[PDB]
mmCIF file of C-alpha atoms in Angstrom:
data_model
loop_
_atom_site.group_PDB
_atom_site.id
_atom_site.type_symbol
_atom_site.label_atom_id
_atom_site.label_comp_id
_atom_site.label_asym_id
_atom_site.label_seq_id
_atom_site.Cartn_x
_atom_site.Cartn_y
_atom_site.Cartn_z
ATOM 1 C CA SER A 1 1.497 -12.325 85.129
ATOM 2 C CA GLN A 2 4.481 -11.471 87.415
ATOM 3 C CA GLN A 3 6.721 -10.671 84.399
ATOM 4 C CA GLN A 4 4.080 -8.570 82.634
ATOM 5 C CA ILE A 5 3.560 -6.616 85.902
ATOM 6 C CA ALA A 6 7.298 -6.083 86.444
ATOM 7 C CA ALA A 7 7.418 -4.519 82.954
ATOM 8 C CA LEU A 8 4.370 -2.353 83.854
ATOM 9 C CA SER A 9 6.396 -1.119 86.885
ATOM 10 C CA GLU A 10 9.479 -0.492 84.669
ATOM 11 C CA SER A 11 7.159 1.418 82.351
ATOM 12 C CA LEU A 12 5.546 3.431 85.196
ATOM 13 C CA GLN A 13 9.063 4.370 86.411
ATOM 14 C CA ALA A 14 9.945 5.796 83.036
ATOM 15 C CA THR A 15 6.590 7.743 83.094
ATOM 16 C CA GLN A 16 7.423 9.146 86.522
ATOM 17 C CA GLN A 17 10.841 10.093 85.035
ATOM 18 C CA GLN A 18 9.141 11.793 82.051
ATOM 19 C CA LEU A 19 6.994 13.727 84.524
ATOM 20 C CA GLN A 20 10.147 14.797 86.438
ATOM 21 C CA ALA A 21 11.558 16.064 83.186
ATOM 22 C CA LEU A 22 8.348 18.025 82.588
ATOM 23 C CA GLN A 23 8.252 19.523 86.049
ATOM 24 C CA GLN A 24 11.829 20.697 85.422
ATOM 25 C CA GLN A 25 10.752 22.370 82.210
ATOM 26 C CA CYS A 26 7.776 23.922 83.911
ATOM 27 C CA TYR A 27 10.014 25.513 86.566
ATOM 28 C CA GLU A 28 12.030 27.068 83.872
ATOM 29 C CA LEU A 29 8.865 28.287 82.123
ATOM 30 C CA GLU A 30 7.696 29.833 85.335
ATOM 31 C CA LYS A 31 11.031 31.516 85.950
ATOM 32 C CA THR A 32 10.926 33.257 82.676
ATOM 33 C CA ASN A 33 7.286 34.194 82.937
ATOM 34 C CA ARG A 34 7.946 35.667 86.389
ATOM 35 C CA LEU A 35 10.751 37.662 85.016
ATOM 36 C CA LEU A 36 8.610 38.899 82.199
ATOM 37 C CA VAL A 37 5.988 40.076 84.602
ATOM 38 C CA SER A 38 8.618 42.057 86.468
ATOM 39 C CA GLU A 39 9.930 43.574 83.273
ATOM 40 C CA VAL A 40 6.555 44.488 81.940
ATOM 41 C CA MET A 41 5.727 46.165 85.247
ATOM 42 C CA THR A 42 8.972 48.077 85.053
ATOM 43 C CA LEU A 43 8.043 49.170 81.567
ATOM 44 C CA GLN A 44 4.654 50.277 82.758
ATOM 45 C CA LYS A 45 6.314 52.555 85.286
ATOM 46 C CA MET A 46 8.562 54.048 82.652
ATOM 47 C CA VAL A 47 5.756 54.638 80.202
ATOM 48 C CA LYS A 48 3.672 56.256 82.958
ATOM 49 C CA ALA A 49 6.554 58.515 83.732
ATOM 50 C CA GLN A 50 6.665 59.383 80.009
ATOM 51 C CA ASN A 51 2.992 60.331 80.116
ATOM 52 C CA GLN A 52 3.785 62.882 82.786
ATOM 53 C CA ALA A 53 6.819 64.196 80.908
ATOM 54 C CA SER A 54 4.664 64.533 77.780
ATOM 55 C CA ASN A 55 1.918 66.425 79.631
ATOM 56 C CA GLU A 56 4.423 68.804 81.139
ATOM 57 C CA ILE A 57 5.671 69.573 77.637
ATOM 58 C CA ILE A 58 2.114 70.265 76.515
ATOM 59 C CA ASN A 59 1.440 72.497 79.497
ATOM 60 C CA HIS A 60 4.647 74.586 78.885
ATOM 61 C CA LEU A 61 4.103 75.003 75.170
ATOM 62 C CA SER B 1 0.908 -10.714 93.431
ATOM 63 C CA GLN B 2 -1.338 -8.367 95.413
ATOM 64 C CA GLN B 3 1.555 -6.379 96.976
ATOM 65 C CA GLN B 4 3.277 -5.676 93.641
ATOM 66 C CA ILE B 5 -0.057 -4.471 92.216
ATOM 67 C CA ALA B 6 -0.863 -2.305 95.248
ATOM 68 C CA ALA B 7 2.525 -0.579 94.675
ATOM 69 C CA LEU B 8 1.727 -0.131 90.974
ATOM 70 C CA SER B 9 -1.357 1.715 92.284
ATOM 71 C CA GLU B 10 0.196 3.774 95.242
ATOM 72 C CA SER B 11 2.810 5.052 92.794
ATOM 73 C CA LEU B 12 0.009 6.018 90.433
ATOM 74 C CA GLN B 13 -1.553 8.120 93.245
ATOM 75 C CA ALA B 14 1.660 10.068 93.571
ATOM 76 C CA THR B 15 1.808 10.589 89.782
ATOM 77 C CA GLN B 16 -1.796 11.866 89.782
ATOM 78 C CA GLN B 17 -0.850 14.215 92.568
ATOM 79 C CA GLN B 18 2.082 15.552 90.657
ATOM 80 C CA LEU B 19 -0.091 16.128 87.638
ATOM 81 C CA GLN B 20 -2.566 18.096 89.797
ATOM 82 C CA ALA B 21 0.335 20.187 91.020
ATOM 83 C CA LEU B 22 1.379 20.864 87.442
ATOM 84 C CA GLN B 23 -2.150 21.861 86.414
ATOM 85 C CA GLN B 24 -2.161 24.385 89.278
ATOM 86 C CA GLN B 25 1.127 25.805 88.149
ATOM 87 C CA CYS B 26 -0.087 26.066 84.608
ATOM 88 C CA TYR B 27 -3.279 27.802 85.742
ATOM 89 C CA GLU B 28 -1.259 30.460 87.433
ATOM 90 C CA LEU B 29 0.716 30.932 84.246
ATOM 91 C CA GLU B 30 -2.551 31.271 82.235
ATOM 92 C CA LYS B 31 -3.683 33.934 84.653
ATOM 93 C CA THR B 32 -0.477 35.814 84.439
ATOM 94 C CA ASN B 33 -0.497 35.751 80.651
ATOM 95 C CA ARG B 34 -4.008 37.249 80.658
ATOM 96 C CA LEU B 35 -2.808 39.980 82.894
ATOM 97 C CA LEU B 36 0.175 40.636 80.675
ATOM 98 C CA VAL B 37 -2.147 41.004 77.668
ATOM 99 C CA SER B 38 -4.091 43.627 79.441
ATOM 100 C CA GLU B 39 -0.987 45.516 80.508
ATOM 101 C CA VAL B 40 0.508 45.517 77.086
ATOM 102 C CA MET B 41 -2.794 46.742 75.520
ATOM 103 C CA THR B 42 -2.888 49.573 77.882
ATOM 104 C CA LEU B 43 0.665 50.543 77.217
ATOM 105 C CA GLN B 44 -0.330 50.820 73.567
ATOM 106 C CA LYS B 45 -3.080 53.145 74.509
ATOM 107 C CA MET B 46 -0.807 55.380 76.571
ATOM 108 C CA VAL B 47 1.881 55.501 73.884
ATOM 109 C CA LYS B 48 -0.724 56.345 71.237
ATOM 110 C CA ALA B 49 -1.884 59.207 73.438
ATOM 111 C CA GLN B 50 1.691 60.424 73.864
ATOM 112 C CA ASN B 51 2.172 60.290 70.047
ATOM 113 C CA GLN B 52 -0.978 62.460 69.617
ATOM 114 C CA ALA B 53 0.239 64.998 72.096
ATOM 115 C CA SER B 54 3.563 65.016 70.338
ATOM 116 C CA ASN B 55 1.940 65.559 66.915
ATOM 117 C CA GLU B 56 -0.111 68.433 68.197
ATOM 118 C CA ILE B 57 3.053 70.107 69.319
ATOM 119 C CA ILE B 58 4.607 69.466 65.891
ATOM 120 C CA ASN B 59 1.553 70.656 63.914
ATOM 121 C CA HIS B 60 0.510 73.947 65.482
ATOM 122 C CA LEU B 61 3.650 75.172 67.075
ATOM 123 C CA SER C 1 -7.831 -9.295 91.739
ATOM 124 C CA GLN C 2 -8.881 -8.971 88.204
ATOM 125 C CA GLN C 3 -10.376 -6.381 90.609
ATOM 126 C CA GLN C 4 -7.040 -4.782 91.583
ATOM 127 C CA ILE C 5 -6.144 -4.563 87.917
ATOM 128 C CA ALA C 6 -9.514 -3.073 86.913
ATOM 129 C CA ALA C 7 -8.882 -0.293 89.486
ATOM 130 C CA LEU C 8 -5.417 0.262 88.119
ATOM 131 C CA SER C 9 -7.019 0.703 84.683
ATOM 132 C CA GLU C 10 -9.626 3.085 86.073
ATOM 133 C CA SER C 11 -6.708 4.971 87.589
ATOM 134 C CA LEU C 12 -4.436 5.135 84.540
ATOM 135 C CA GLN C 13 -7.427 6.425 82.484
ATOM 136 C CA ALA C 14 -7.910 9.291 84.905
ATOM 137 C CA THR C 15 -4.174 10.094 84.693
ATOM 138 C CA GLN C 16 -4.368 10.160 80.926
ATOM 139 C CA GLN C 17 -7.349 12.487 81.305
ATOM 140 C CA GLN C 18 -5.359 14.749 83.680
ATOM 141 C CA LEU C 19 -2.691 14.896 81.040
ATOM 142 C CA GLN C 20 -5.283 15.920 78.436
ATOM 143 C CA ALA C 21 -6.437 18.679 80.742
ATOM 144 C CA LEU C 22 -2.856 19.877 81.091
ATOM 145 C CA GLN C 23 -2.396 19.827 77.265
ATOM 146 C CA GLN C 24 -5.557 22.022 77.103
ATOM 147 C CA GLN C 25 -3.906 24.428 79.508
ATOM 148 C CA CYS C 26 -0.767 24.529 77.436
ATOM 149 C CA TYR C 27 -2.873 25.340 74.320
ATOM 150 C CA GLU C 28 -4.356 28.238 76.172
ATOM 151 C CA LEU C 29 -0.845 29.488 77.060
ATOM 152 C CA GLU C 30 0.172 29.209 73.430
ATOM 153 C CA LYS C 31 -2.768 31.297 72.400
ATOM 154 C CA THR C 32 -2.057 34.071 74.799
ATOM 155 C CA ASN C 33 1.705 33.988 74.092
ATOM 156 C CA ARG C 34 0.846 34.451 70.423
ATOM 157 C CA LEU C 35 -1.243 37.433 71.375
ATOM 158 C CA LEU C 36 1.563 38.816 73.442
ATOM 159 C CA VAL C 37 4.136 38.409 70.695
ATOM 160 C CA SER C 38 1.872 40.349 68.328
ATOM 161 C CA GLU C 39 0.920 42.981 70.711
ATOM 162 C CA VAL C 40 4.400 43.597 72.017
ATOM 163 C CA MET C 41 5.618 44.009 68.439
ATOM 164 C CA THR C 42 2.858 46.568 67.825
ATOM 165 C CA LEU C 43 3.871 48.394 70.947
ATOM 166 C CA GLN C 44 7.443 48.546 69.629
ATOM 167 C CA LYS C 45 6.177 50.218 66.458
ATOM 168 C CA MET C 46 4.289 52.758 68.414
ATOM 169 C CA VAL C 47 7.193 53.574 70.729
ATOM 170 C CA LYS C 48 9.471 53.988 67.693
ATOM 171 C CA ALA C 49 6.919 56.345 66.157
ATOM 172 C CA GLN C 50 7.140 58.287 69.411
ATOM 173 C CA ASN C 51 10.857 58.471 69.151
ATOM 174 C CA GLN C 52 10.463 59.972 65.625
ATOM 175 C CA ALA C 53 7.930 62.445 66.852
ATOM 176 C CA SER C 54 10.343 63.383 69.639
ATOM 177 C CA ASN C 55 13.203 63.952 67.239
ATOM 178 C CA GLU C 56 11.084 66.116 64.981
ATOM 179 C CA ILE C 57 10.275 68.283 67.953
ATOM 180 C CA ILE C 58 13.976 68.514 68.754
ATOM 181 C CA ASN C 59 14.741 69.580 65.158
ATOM 182 C CA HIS C 60 12.075 72.330 65.241
ATOM 183 C CA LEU C 61 13.759 73.589 68.435
ATOM 184 C CA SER D 1 -5.768 -11.301 82.512
ATOM 185 C CA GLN D 2 -2.869 -11.103 80.005
ATOM 186 C CA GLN D 3 -5.157 -9.039 77.775
ATOM 187 C CA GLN D 4 -6.043 -6.500 80.463
ATOM 188 C CA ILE D 5 -2.336 -6.026 81.133
ATOM 189 C CA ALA D 6 -1.492 -5.631 77.445
ATOM 190 C CA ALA D 7 -4.072 -2.764 77.358
ATOM 191 C CA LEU D 8 -2.404 -1.239 80.472
ATOM 192 C CA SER D 9 0.847 -1.308 78.507
ATOM 193 C CA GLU D 10 -0.794 0.230 75.455
ATOM 194 C CA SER D 11 -2.042 2.925 77.762
ATOM 195 C CA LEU D 12 1.211 3.604 79.678
ATOM 196 C CA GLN D 13 3.017 4.056 76.303
ATOM 197 C CA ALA D 14 0.498 6.648 75.222
ATOM 198 C CA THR D 15 0.910 8.472 78.565
ATOM 199 C CA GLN D 16 4.685 8.552 78.060
ATOM 200 C CA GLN D 17 3.950 9.947 74.577
ATOM 201 C CA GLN D 18 1.625 12.607 76.005
ATOM 202 C CA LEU D 19 4.330 13.578 78.472
ATOM 203 C CA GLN D 20 6.826 13.974 75.634
ATOM 204 C CA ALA D 21 4.337 16.130 73.740
ATOM 205 C CA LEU D 22 3.832 18.286 76.810
ATOM 206 C CA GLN D 23 7.590 18.709 77.316
ATOM 207 C CA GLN D 24 7.843 19.891 73.730
ATOM 208 C CA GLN D 25 5.015 22.348 74.196
ATOM 209 C CA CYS D 26 6.535 23.712 77.377
ATOM 210 C CA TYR D 27 9.914 24.138 75.640
ATOM 211 C CA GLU D 28 8.304 26.207 72.946
ATOM 212 C CA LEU D 29 6.423 28.283 75.521
ATOM 213 C CA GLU D 30 9.655 29.017 77.336
ATOM 214 C CA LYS D 31 11.368 30.056 74.104
ATOM 215 C CA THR D 32 8.600 32.480 73.444
ATOM 216 C CA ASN D 33 8.756 33.862 76.996
ATOM 217 C CA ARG D 34 12.523 34.476 76.473
ATOM 218 C CA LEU D 35 11.787 36.345 73.362
ATOM 219 C CA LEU D 36 9.153 38.436 75.057
ATOM 220 C CA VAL D 37 11.559 39.317 77.946
ATOM 221 C CA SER D 38 14.035 40.507 75.375
ATOM 222 C CA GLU D 39 11.598 42.544 73.485
ATOM 223 C CA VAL D 40 10.227 44.180 76.689
ATOM 224 C CA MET D 41 13.775 45.051 77.723
ATOM 225 C CA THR D 42 14.359 46.657 74.325
ATOM 226 C CA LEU D 43 11.119 48.629 74.926
ATOM 227 C CA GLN D 44 12.533 49.822 78.208
ATOM 228 C CA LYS D 45 15.700 51.075 76.517
ATOM 229 C CA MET D 46 13.587 52.947 73.947
ATOM 230 C CA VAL D 47 11.339 54.535 76.577
ATOM 231 C CA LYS D 48 14.416 55.673 78.534
ATOM 232 C CA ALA D 49 15.777 57.261 75.398
ATOM 233 C CA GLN D 50 12.370 58.988 75.019
ATOM 234 C CA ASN D 51 12.733 60.342 78.518
ATOM 235 C CA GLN D 52 16.078 61.892 77.455
ATOM 236 C CA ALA D 53 14.534 63.354 74.327
ATOM 237 C CA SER D 54 11.734 64.726 76.561
ATOM 238 C CA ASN D 55 14.505 66.353 78.553
#
């Protein structure tokens, strides 16, 4: 019993360590996804601006 | 004995909590991806429109 | 205290289930990433096509 | 029970395996996000160039 339960605690420690590794990964995933949001929103602005530039061309044909 | 096994459990509470935290993080990433999809589809639509306006210039003029 | 250990088993089952829920979330992120990869590549095509349309205008000026 | 505790161990190993699988998934998701960030930045460069052609 005591020995089996010590090994269960060794095994739960390694699980907690695996979860720490996963949280780390998830932070990095979030970082990049946040960045992507910010870049896509920048693109949106630039494409919008291009709409207006296009229309102006049309209207001065 | 009972103390060792209570700790096996009180550690498991903290693990479960961490997992809940990770599920929340991942939900927010799921949301953000859905939003990105929408943005990108609309950019397509705007660029398409700009291409049409361009072509009209090319064709008639 | 077979009792304590039954509750630990109840508890590790729920954790495993939390992990399954998180894997489900990650599948959903994969799906939408795949959509994004595709759609962003389509947007790149369209924006290129715009660039060609632009140039043609320039040449006819 | 020795048996109950062997099944706990069977279960903790599978959890550790699940966590490894999830780490792999999240790696691949991050790779794809990096690719997307690159491609969106290339799209920005192209749209800027379009602005200059517009001008």
